[PDB]
């Protein structure tokens, strides 16, 4: 499929600027794109301009960090108005503790025998307030402390390992409501990554829907084919719309393309058509 509704830019943890990531996606002749940076909309105006210039329909997007019980989950919004005040304030409240947490992650790694990780991570991060475990991982790989990204999260930056600092993100109710109140659809991102069996997934979906959630990622760069099959069925039982995204961050860690949705799925983009920013001004 030539649709991609999930990816990142230097606004949060992606390696490419909003212009660069859109331009890269554009090589695949995509029919629709949505930039979804973590807990931030700062790249949307640039991404929109870059998409329109290449003749590509575009949706405003975001990826919101949520703590649900002991789990961190990510809720994507699509078709949001980033200027809506409640959403803007909510996202800001989620970013607030990020820098503090990062200094602590660095100090944790230092206690475990790797000094200089906060500073190193910062070298990879254009916007200090968006500082992320992703930047720490790039540092650990680039500086040769760890051989690759996969090995980083095996030894570090996860619960019980040096560099991980527990943190409370948005509530599920807040994340979904901010998205919906901004005119968008809320989407459970990359559900196959969560440590949950079919019972917890069902519980998450029910809570998600109660809060106003309508969508779930079925095609995802983070999903196996078995994942796609399994989450297509979860979506169908609850009447959720299916989203697709690459979750692209960097080259060699692709944007503008996703796996075709299973036939059972109701594609979320069909429901977002009124929120699509069209390349032709007159069509908006």
Q: Which residues are annotated as a binding site?
A: 6, 8, 13, 38, 63, 74, 98-101, 133-134, 190, 247, 249
Contacts of 135 (CB under 8 A, 6+ apart): 13, 121, 122, 124, 125
**Least spacing, CB of residue 238 vs ligand AMP, in Å:** 25
CB-count burial class (<10 Å; 0-12, 13-18, 19+) for 271: middle
**Least spacing, CB of residue 156 vs ligand AMP, in Å:** 10
For Mn ion, which is the closer residue by CB, 101 or 278?
A: 101
Asked if 246 and 36 touch (Cβ cutoff 8 Å), the reply is: no
**Residue 217 binds Mn ion (CB under 5 A):** no
Site for Mn ion in 73-92 (CB under 5 A): 74
Q: Among the residues of the chain, which ranges form H helices?
A: 18-26, 44-53, 85-95, 98-111, 117-122, 133-142, 149-155, 172-181, 198-210, 225-238, 268-271
Site for Mn ion in 150-189 (CB under 5 A): 189
The region that residue 139 occupies, defined by phi over 0 for left and psi between -120 and 50 for alpha, beta otherwise, is: alpha
Choose which of 4, 13, 46, 174 interacts with Mn ion (CB under 5 A): 13
What is d(CA 244, CA 189) in angstroms, rounded to the nearest whole number? 9
Residue 65 interacting partner from Mn ion, ligand AMP, none (CB closer than 5 to 8 Å by kind) = ligand AMP
What is d(CA 157, CA 174) in angstroms, rounded to the nearest whole number? 26
Contacts of 99 (CB under 8 A, 6+ apart): 128, 129, 131
**Residue 98 binds Mn ion (CB under 5 A):** no
Q: Which residues are annotated as a binding site for Mn(2+)?
A: 6, 8, 13, 38, 63, 74, 190, 247, 249
For Mn ion, which is the closer residue by CB, 74 or 138?
A: 74
Contacts of 161 (CB under 8 A, 6+ apart): 155
What is d(CA 134, CA 155) in angstroms, rounded to the nearest whole number? 14
Contacts of 144 (CB under 8 A, 6+ apart): none
Residues touching Mn ion: how many (CB under 5 A)? 5
Residue 247 interacting partner from ligand AMP, Mn ion, none (CB closer than 5 to 8 Å by kind) = Mn ion
Q: Which residues bind ligand AMP (CB under 6 A)?
A: 13, 38, 65, 132-134, 149, 153, 249
Residue 149 interacting partner from Mn ion, ligand AMP, none (CB closer than 5 to 8 Å by kind) = ligand AMP
**Residues in the chain, total:** 284
Find the part of the chain contacting Mn ion (CB under 5 A) among 60-68, 146-154, 229-237, 272-280. 60-68
For ligand AMP, which is the closer residue by CB, 154 or 229?
A: 154
Choose which of 37, 174, 217, 247 interacts with Mn ion (CB under 5 A): 247
Residues facing 205 on adjacent strands: none
Q: Which residues are annotated as a binding site for substrate?
A: 13, 38, 98-101, 133-134, 249
**Least spacing, CB of residue 138 vs Mn ion, in Å:** 11
Residue 153 interacting partner from Mn ion, ligand AMP, none (CB closer than 5 to 8 Å by kind) = ligand AMP
Report the interface residues with Mn ion, using CB under 5 A: 13, 63, 74, 189, 247
């Amino acid at each position: 499929a030539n649709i991609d509704l999930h990816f990142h830019s230097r606004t949060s943890d992606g390696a490419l600027t909003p212009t660069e990531v859109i331009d890269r996606a554009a090589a695949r002749a995509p029919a629709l794109l949505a930039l979804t940076d973590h807990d931030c909309t700062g790249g949307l105006a640039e991404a929109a301009a870059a998409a329109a210039r290449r003749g590509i329909p575009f949706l405003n997007g975001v990826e919101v960090s949520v703590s649900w019980g002991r789990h961190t989950v990510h809720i994507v919004g699509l078709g949001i108005d980033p200027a809506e005040p409640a959403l803007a304030a909510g996202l800001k409240s989620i970013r607030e503790g990020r820098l503090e947490r990062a200094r602590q992650m660095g100090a944790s790694l230092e206690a475990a025998g790797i000094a200089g990780c906060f500073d190193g991570a910062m070298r990879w991060c254009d916007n200090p307030e968006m500082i992320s475990r992703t930047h720490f991982a790039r540092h650990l790989v680039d500086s040769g402390a760890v051989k690759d990204m996969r090995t980083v999260f095996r030894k570090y930056l996860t619960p019980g390992k040096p560099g991980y600092v527990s943190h409370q993100w948005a509530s599920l109710e807040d994340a979904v409501g901010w998205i919906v109140g901004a005119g968008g659809m809320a989407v459970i991102a990359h559900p196959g990554r969560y440590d949950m069996g079919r019972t917890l997934i069902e519980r998450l979906i029910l809570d998600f829907q109660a809060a106003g959630g309508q969508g779930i990622e079925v095609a995802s760069g983070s999903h196996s084919l078995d994942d796609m099959h399994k989450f297509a069925l979860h979506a169908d039982r609850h009447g959720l719309y299916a989203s697709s995204g690459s979750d692209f961050h960097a080259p060699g860690e692709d944007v503008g393309h996703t796996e075709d949705l299973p036939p059972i799925c109701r594609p979320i983009w069909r429901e977002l058509e009124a929120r699509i920013l069209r390349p032709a001004d007159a069509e908006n």
